[PDB]
RNA sequence: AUGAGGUGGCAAGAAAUGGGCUACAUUUUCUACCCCAGAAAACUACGAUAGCCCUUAUGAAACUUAAGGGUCGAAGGUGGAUUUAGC
């Protein structure tokens, strides 16, 4: 267990946990992550029968900013960037897991590129005739949004 | 006039056959990208560089030649005997 950590609460992760994997319970995978996890990481959860996420500095830095958030000031925009496959998505998921366990309302868009390509039913909107609706993309997200924030809706 | 010039015209397809091109698809089709993606995937799929219509390019001259677009969505579902090429 040299690569694992017994601290499964993302609110208690610190620099001493860097490089160590913490476990995400199956209950949180169903509620917090009905979507957003990388497709290949989802294959690993099915194969290893567990979801373990390495604690890294990008997420630790961002967790430090969110724990000191001044909710009176306007919302701050944090942007994760880096080369392909460096762990941008999973760093975001580690932060989503922190706020989910702090009773925040999670508005998670797992992949915004899916809303600008490969749309079969692109209907015209009735609320605004100059805009287009996307019933399949919108209904899919509503189902996952309901699963994550069911206790607040 | 078996020579010279002018005007207009033929150069088609019952059929057979040689070579080639494109396909019959999932190691595929479309898009992004040029290789860590998203979709498509059987009668609105794959599949025409064919047919029909229009535009454009060249030209004095274009149903005719070429390019592009629209429309159209066929045979084909991997091919018998035989046979070609490659160290
Ligand atoms: N924190 C982590 N814990 C465990 N595995 C990780 C972690 N970060 C990255 N990985 C591994 O790297 C892979 C890629 O991670 P991820 O998809 O988050 O990267 P990314 O930079 O967002 O990728 P892309 O550039 O494609 O959007 C994961 O599927 C996993 O195998
Ligand atoms: K042939
Ligand atoms: K053949
Ligand atoms: Mg990512
Ligand atoms: Mg004569
Ligand atoms: Mg078709
Ligand atoms: Mg044509
Ligand atoms: Mg002209």
Method used for this model?
Answer: cryo-EM
Q: Is A4 helix (H, G, I), strand (E, B) or coil?
A: strand
Residue A19 Cα to chain centre, angstroms: 20
Strands (E), A25-76: 51-54
DSSP A71-100: TTSPPPP-----STTSSHHHHHHHHHHHHH
The answer to whether residues A93 and A53 touch, using CB atoms and an 8 Å cutoff, is yes
Using the structure, give the distance in angstroms from the CA atom of A134 to the C1' atom of B45, rounded to a whole number: 24
Residue A80 in contact with ligand 1 by CB distance below 6 A: no
Residue A112 to residue A57: CA distance in whole angstroms:
25
Question: What tokens appear for A116 in the block?
Answer: 């600008």
Residue A60 to residue A17: CA distance in whole angstroms:
9
Q: Is A127 helix (H, G, I), strand (E, B) or coil?
A: coil
């Amino acid at each position: 267990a040299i690569s694992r950590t017994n601290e499964n609460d993302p609110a208690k992760h610190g620099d001493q946990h860097e490089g160590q994997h913490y476990n995400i319970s199956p209950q949180d995978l169903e509620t917090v992550f009905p979507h957003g996890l990388p497709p290949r990481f989802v294959m690993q959860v099915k194969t290893f029968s567990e979801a373990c996420l390495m604690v890294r500095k990008p997420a630790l830095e961002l967790l430090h900013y969110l724990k000191n958030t001044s909710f009176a000031y306007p919302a701050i925009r944090y942007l994760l960037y880096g080369e392909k496959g460096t762990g941008k998505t999973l760093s975001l998921c580690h932060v989503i897991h922190f706020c989910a366990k702090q009773d925040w309302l999670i508005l998670h868009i797992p992949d915004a590129h899916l809303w600008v390509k490969n749309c079969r039913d692109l209907l015209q909107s009735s609320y605004n005739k100059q805009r287009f609706d996307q019933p399949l993309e919108a209904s899919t997200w509503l189902k996952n949004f309901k699963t994550t924030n069911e206790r607040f809706l």
